[PDB]
Design a protein around this ligand. Sequence first.
Ligand SMILES: CC[C@H](C)C(=O)O[C@H]1C[C@@H](C)C=C2C=C[C@H](C)[C@H](CC[C@@H]3C[C@@H](O)CC(=O)O3)[C@H]21
Ligand SMILES: [Mg+2]
Length: 184
Amino acid sequence: GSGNVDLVFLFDGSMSLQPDEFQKILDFMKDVMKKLSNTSYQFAAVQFSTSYKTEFDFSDYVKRKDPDALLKHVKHMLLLTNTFGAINYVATEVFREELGARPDATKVLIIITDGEATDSGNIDAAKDIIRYIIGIGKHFQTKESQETLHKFASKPASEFVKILDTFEKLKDLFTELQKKIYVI
Ligand SMILES: CC[C@H](C)C(=O)O[C@H]1C[C@@H](C)C=C2C=C[C@H](C)[C@H](CC[C@@H]3C[C@@H](O)CC(=O)O3)[C@H]21
Ligand SMILES: [Mg+2]
């Protein structure tokens, strides 16, 4: 339709993440934004743990644009992993016209986490958002834990759930993303 994509990074700041691992999440987000600067994509980023913080809104991105400056002042929260609550927060408190969301854009949520959710609920309010979940590291070693992530993602899980055994594999994920960039 409009050809516009409003994309939110929803990233884990729980106590499980070591300092260097948290930085690699931030570096990955910055790589994606830099590669897609000056396009029809708009970005916002939200850190979640026990509660949620909008690190920058869509309007901040449009005004400042520099991914380095925009994520420079992120404080690691180091609490729990309330992923149900975080998704509902994005759907009702971030995707809003008064915060710079474009009303007819395609909405996309990229969830990066290194643990199973410590809450529960439903995400019906977020169901018109395209949802990718990237699950990283040892807490997703087993098949049963990988499957807990299906609930958050759009369907099929085979396209929308990405499991990475280490944080260094975020770089491989960015290599694969770039092979899919086209001028249309
Ligand atoms: C696309 C390949 C990479 C690895 C990936 O999954 O990136 C996904 C997940 C993550 C790595 C980053 C993304 C950044 C931008 C877009 C939204 C991308 C998904 C792209 C697809 C493209 C078509 O299938 C239509 C659509 O709506 O989503 C995601
Ligand atoms: Mg966690």
